[PDB]
């Protein structure tokens with residue numbers, strides 16, 4: 001039936017650039033748009049596991065990813081005065097490095113920045129997208145790759161067609177000058193169900209920080225970056241160790257990110273000519289560390305099923321939904337299990353090791369169909 005070619009992909013994270021790669025490789029014409037003025041490369045290291053590694057090999061990015069893998073030599077745990085409590089010592093790679101690798105591998109896929117989708121209107125034979133500058137454009141399909149808080153999901157699906165479950169924890173990531181001269185070293189301070197960390201590895205001039213904490217009934221409006229910064233500053237006031245200096249340097253950080261630990265549950269990730277890929281449809285929260293693997297696997301399956309459906313997008317979408325659902329369900333379950341213990345050392349480590357082993361295993365329990 002009618003050929004599908006022109007496809008809008010909204011968001012340039014992991015899922016968006018990955019699905020553009022596979023759509024273009026399989027003979028479609030994806031167009032990538034991003035709301036931010038440039039690529040957002042902030043964020044902590046991610047773990048590429050299992051069949052996603054085979055995808056990286058097929059994508060010709062495996063060697064690049066191995067070359068960019070994290071080299072941290074020393075984990076260090078300290079108390080509020082900086083006394084050392086303890087020291088320690090699939091691919092782990094900084095999120096931004098993976099984003100750039102995927103963008104680079106994309107080839108000739110137009111990538112547009114500072115783009116604001118206002119509305120998405122499904123018509124008989126296409127989807128009409130209006131942008132906040134008044135422009136209207138037509139696409140055969142539209143893909144939300146826009147993350148946990150997906151604008152696309154909100155425009156396309158009714159509120160009773162998705163459920164966000166906030167698990168009661170929040171995290172932040174941002175970069176600062178490496179003022180403690182950490183050398184391939186990660187330092188972490190934990191107290192009172194809060195956590196702060198700082199690590200310098202890839203770049204000796206820069207340290208990436210992270211914050212983790214639990215909160216309930218948040219009064220603040222956390223959709224705004226300034227309110228996020230404010231809530232973080234207020235939560236960690238008087239926390240100890242290096243928190244004060246880190247929060248001071250945060251004012252000049254250009255890669256700030258803040259979010260909740262939240263799972264997205266939907267009976268379907270697709271509606272008509274619209275599909276969600278990655279956190280937009282299936283976020284499992286950071287707890288199991290599967291966000292990137294889900295994005296990479298979902299991208300491949302989405303594009304493959306579309307290729308084989310030869311115009312029948314509803315059939316492709318149904319198979320996409322069905323084939324990825326078991327992996328997502330497993331990941332979300334493991335996320336909830338991790339939640340139950342997050343914020344004796346031996347018991348805790350033993351329980352954590354079992355879950356991580358099981359996460360590693362299910363990452364290898366996906367069949368990747370042959371689309372070529």
Ligand SMILES: Cc1cc2nc3c(=O)[nH]c(=O)nc-3n(C[C@H](O)[C@H](O)[C@H](O)COP(=O)(O)OP(=O)(O)OC[C@H]3O[C@@H](n4cnc5c(N)ncnc54)[C@H](O)[C@@H]3O)c2cc1C
Nearest residue numbers: 011012013014015035043044146147151278279286291292
């Ligand atoms: C800057 C950044 C930092 C992150 N840091 C961490 C971290 O440290 N730890 C962690 O566990 N997870 C982090 N995440 C989430 C993590 O990347 C995801 O869990 C997953 O790995 C990949 O999901 P995704 O590609 O579907 O969505 P995301 O990586 O969230 O990417 C979404 C992309 O869509 C863009 N976007 C959003 N709305 C619109 C719109 N209306 N129009 C166009 N584009 C839009 C975003 O700006 C972003 O580039 C981060 C996400 C971002 C964007």
